[model samples]
Target chain A: AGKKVLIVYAHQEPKSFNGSLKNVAVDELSRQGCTVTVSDLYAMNFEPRATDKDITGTLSNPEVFNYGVETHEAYKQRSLASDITDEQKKVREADLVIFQFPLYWFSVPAILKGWMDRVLCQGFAFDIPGFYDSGLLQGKLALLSVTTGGTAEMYTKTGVNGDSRYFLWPLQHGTLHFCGFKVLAPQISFAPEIASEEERKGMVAAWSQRLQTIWKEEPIPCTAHWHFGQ
Target chain B: AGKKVLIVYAHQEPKSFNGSLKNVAVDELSRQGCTVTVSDLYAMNFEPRATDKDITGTLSNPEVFNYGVETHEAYKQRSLASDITDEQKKVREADLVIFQFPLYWFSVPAILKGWMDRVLCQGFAFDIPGFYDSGLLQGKLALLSVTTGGTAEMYTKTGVNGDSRYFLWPLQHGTLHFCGFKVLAPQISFAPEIASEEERKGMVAAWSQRLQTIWKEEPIPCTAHWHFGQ
Candidate 1:
């Protein structure tokens, strides 16, 4: 009844279809009495590059920089940069994390991808022994609310772009599930830019309606068989 | 015997495993009489964000910025940022493009992703009727030489990460293939950080060996059936 939600949104414009989706989530979830926090990535000009700057004080090995190894150490010593720490703190408090973004290159935009690369470090999000089903944020929920460049027909198994599930595996199974978040089926609004104004409104309405019962939705079985037949 | 190659590299360090992969590609390709141009993203301090700044002149719609739409228009009018046009020139001249980097969240690093988003605009990389097999850059060959934290076993079909091919679909099919490059089988050197010094050398050696016969190799059947199965 008093759930916390964090939306890590990545879109350049507020008046676009992606913006409407983000707005609807906030409005609907707020109406349900859920505490919502939105990280407007584009507006914030979030750092998308993963580099030595991510870690604060010292490099474990200053001679040769390895992002995975360095950030993992920085996280344990609490020497991560303020921006990364801030996002991690938000994730820690949130019961549900919604990633709202337009699909760029069959995945999240560079800004959002940078958020994942920089914020979700080794020790913070997942450890060698504690990943996948037993990851750090096991109880938390995550959803990828993606708007695509192509239509639903183009994402079919035999379609030009291949099955949409094929594209979701990396984000859903490899990243979110690997970090122990139970992933909800993605909220995909296809080709909203080309759709009629009424169609765009209906798409926004559909998302708002879904948010009314978002809590009732169960996580998808994020597996090879579920994504691709055995 | 006179092939031109462009290596779009993303890595912070010069001594890391990813660095070694990039170096080897340069050394071997250059020796084979290939004119190699390397876009060392980190050193170049590449802009990873897609914003209004990318279009040199005024945006088509100042009120609402649609990245895909605006960039498509800017590309046609030749108003794309110099950085983007610079990369495009290299891509156009290259017979082969090799993306060398460590896999971040099961995909290209944000910096490299930015290169694709900004440089591979609709008018430049492909148009509405000119994607996939009929893409504008059809004759060009592309390959992803990636380093990973996970091992071969972990990325298997039934493994924790699902099939490595599952992760490749977005980069290989959705992006590169969509832009019309024939995608060679990826060079995945998994978990080089954990491997013994000898093993790391072997991994680098294998890549060099592959580059020797790269011109003779054929593109993989980049489809849902080839990626998943019937």
Candidate 2:
């Protein structure tokens, strides 16, 4: 089968700083001749609120954790009407999944996290009883592309961001890696808003180049340390 | 400056083991005559997902971060519609905050993290310019009530759970303590699911007792850690 990439893009406004990064990523992936499917969560108006229906469904029925039920039944009905069955199929088929979002309080945005809660369901991404020993998405690759408002210096061990290693642990290691995805070292561009035209262009070009390289090399080895879950 | 308590509850299932503990916390606080507020994220359908609105909002306008637009938005809407403004008002009004959740993948659930992103916005919970040195929520008390599916032995510094300390650094240093909230030792109950009924009930009783202690005690002194931002 051909390599498929799922870019789960999370940005609120279409014309913002991270939006530029998202555009660059899409263009780069397309240019590299990879079958890239972008899930622009915001454009879809994905609700961040997980409703009582969601909670009850998750509790009463175990399958609800994996498939992710919309909070409002009406919204769920509309989603069903739209027939998003194919999207989940694409996610399962994809070899590489890229999570793109800006860092908020040292984590991804809410909509994206909500997507994980719903999309990366228990049985599909992981199994509770056999979680650690046998995560379903083991062979697939997870790549994170995060945009930060603070400069890179601020995230360093001694600098202000309080060690990028610590912040990325929960996302890269805890969620993705723990679920058996071979997590590639994240590509982070700090202070995207403050970047000059040249710097922004360079970042875009650099990302494009990276995509090209990965498309050719396919599945770069991820050496991140992660623990399994219950 | 009345005694304050903040409970950051993170239970996906309010009817399950963790939910009982969560209720204990609320009841104990109310009985203590302390101004108690619960970030009943699930009950309120708080959006645990972060979006582009959060990203651009962070870049263009710093003021939104101060009032915590996301949490405040929820609170404002609730206040306009009802008498209670959910947990955001409690967070602002209280001198103490507690996080109660079942441990998921060695961390709090997505909802609690979402709370930090939305409720702990820039000006109110942190200051970007001064590196979060001075914020409105400074000098508050922070507490954690977490349940684990595994035995306490597994969470030891040398056991299978890695070091509980390693997992907690982010919460202790990254969020609460970093923002100048006086951090207290967390309350933990292990192996909740498999625990005997008596043990489970005992834990609930313990949780009630702990909240009472937190409500009465002075906020712990903030220890300056190297990892704390600014």
Candidate 3:
């Protein structure tokens, strides 16, 4: 029952609804005797760009800058930036990783997305042959605890956003599933800003309660059919 | 026939395949007597974090931070950061906006995604009643000219990554269409690094040719059906 949890939190204000959700997780998890560490990307002022700075050594091919290729090589040689390697170390140590952020453009914030682009490189997260079912991060759990500006109704199949699950395909299936994390069904807290104070508190309380039994939860069947349905 | 085009190009190296595709777009569009501006995100070292730095004035709610709410207010007050406003100006003047980037984790690179999150704010791109068909930027057109590390076969329904279209839903429908820009079908150049020199050149040439008659093309319906299929 001594699970190590990493919360890759990406939000600016400490008093925001997103902040509440993240704090509650730490509180609940810590009370249960779990070790919790938060990345706090905004507070860390994490560099979101993927550039030459990512590689500490000489370029594998100075003539052409292929991020996937160069980063893969840097990762193998232990030449990636310390920030990237630092995050990788957390990922390596964690039994579960929870990404906490507000949904921006139907996806994670750019800063959080940058974390994925930089931290989840080749060799570390996946290799050409070792991906999907055979991914490197097998046995690790990943979950998206997302807050949205849109309401639950607007994200339904008949809603304007065309099903919330539709938007989850890229993150849940394309990235996390490909990387071999058993993805827990995402906890979506919709329209937090628009909701009443009681409703906002209720959302955070629900998330905290979910964490109590999170270890017993099974990952969703992360297939195309599971996401899209036949 | 006199049109203005803004290419939000995101790639680290100028000699890479993404660079070739971007160069082709510029040359072809210039030959057609159109004005072109390329926001080379890497060269500019674009800031990707959506924080209070984005707003120039005191917070509307100092105690709490809501990025969407804050940015929306910033847009209305014309108090957004100069960099963000500068890009919004380009979007306002352009008849067509083209995003050129290598697909990272099945989505736009974090830097480019930041451009969308920061530049396309509520008052500038869409408001509560001014989204979808009633969006503010209805007269403008947008296209994604993407390069991928994976091949066409790898992006198929039966392929390891599932259908390529599955990944386009968030960008095409959720972001672009929501902002009221007419969306063009994506131009995906697969496995550019693995391709022969001739094949790479052909890919660039094909993109240039497409730009010549880009105006003659019609926007896809941009419905959920178009992305997910019935």
Candidate 4:
């Protein structure tokens, strides 16, 4: 009952549908006696760009700046910016990491993307010989609770946007799986802007209901076939 | 000879391999009598988040905020942020839009992704009915010239990362083609950090040479089959 959860939220307005979803998650998780922390990227005004500024100390190689290499070393030496370390600390303490955001261009918002780029640096998220099945954050659970502007019908295999699973590959497999998180099946709230107020509430309630039994859930296979099946 | 090209470049350092590739593009395009404009995203310190601040004049719905709907209205009313409008103008003026960046977590850096999200709003880049094959940017061309830390072998069908095309689906099909831009085959220069000085220079020269004959190139048939075969 004392499980820790980190919600990496990326949305500007707290009155938005995404905000409602985030609130529901917090309420449900907290009610279960879980420790909840939310990184409100917009409210925090989190810096999304990854540059030399991320490394507070002198670079190991000053001539050429390779983010992956430099950030790896900076993280190991405890020379990364406080913002990055702060997020890393939250991640380190979390048993489950929930990414709550509206899908932007079929992906996470830029600010959240920045969080992944900067916080999930090498040595922290993954090392060269110890990635994928053997990632650093292997014990943690990660889930994507995304809201999309497109309807569920539009995200099917034969639909206009192809399968929704197609778009989830990069985030689930490439990033989260690469970092060694056990990824829960994503919770996608489709076309919330077009949904009636009652429907919106239903979506929120559904999410809370799901959280009631979330611990019993198992991680997806996260294989190529699961993402792009025959 | 008079075509305009917009290179949306995203890299932190001026001496990095990404910078060299960007510089060569400018040189070759200029030498070919093409007008080239580069958007150095990190140098510009562009804002990535979509917020209430993006809409200048008034909110269509003050109580609730929807980025897709709000930004669409803002674009129509000319109430979007000046930085967003500035990038929009460049996209409108360009005959070709090239994204240059080092791959961060299998996608473009946060700054470039921010450009795609903030600048390519509903009314500006695509409308409800004017997306996919009938997008607003039908005549223009788009390309992603990416550098990766992983080798070419690692991005193959049997590699640890699966096919590189798996990751390209989101950017190419979901965003670029959805906005109606004729998508070009990506120029992926692999493992620049591990490459020798001669190899790095060769990669730069290869890109420059490709630019000289770019006009003769045909857009990829950006269909589901191309990205994910049956």
TM-score of each model, paired residue for residue? 0.98, 0.79, 0.98, 0.98
Model 4: per-residue Cα lDDT over B96-160, one tens digit each: 99999988888889988999999999998999899999999999999999998889999987888
lDDT over C-alpha atoms for residue B191 of model 2: 86
**Which DockQ values do the candidates obtain, in the order shown?**
0.88, 0.31, 0.86, 0.79
Q: Candidates' interface RMSDs, in order?
A: 0.8, 5.4, 0.8, 1.1
- Model 2 earns a TM-score of 0.79
lDDT of 2 at B116: 76
TM-score of chain B of each: 0.98, 0.76, 0.98, 0.98
- Measured by DockQ, the strongest candidate is 1
lDDT string, candidate 3, B90-113, tens digits: 999999999999999999999999
Evaluated at residue A116, the lDDT of candidate 1 is: 91
Candidate 1 chain A worst ten-residue window by lDDT: A221-230
Q: Compared with the real two-chain complex, what DockQ does model 2 have?
A: 0.31
Between prediction 1 and prediction 3, which has the larger DockQ?
Answer: 1
Docking class of 2: acceptable
User: Where does model 3 exceed 4 Å of error?
Assistant: none
* Ten-residue stretch with the least lDDT total in model 2 chain A: A221-230
Q: Chain B of model 4: TM-score? A: 0.98
Model 1: per-residue Cα lDDT over A1-230, one tens digit each: 59999999999889888888999899999988999999999899999999888888789899988888889999999998899999999999999999999999899888898999998888889998999998998999999999987999999877898888888988998899999997998999998978998998899999999999999999999888888765
What is the lDDT, from 0 to 100, of the residue B193 in candidate 3?
A: 85
Show model 4 residue runs off by greater than 4 Å: none
* Model 3 share of native interface contacts: 0.86
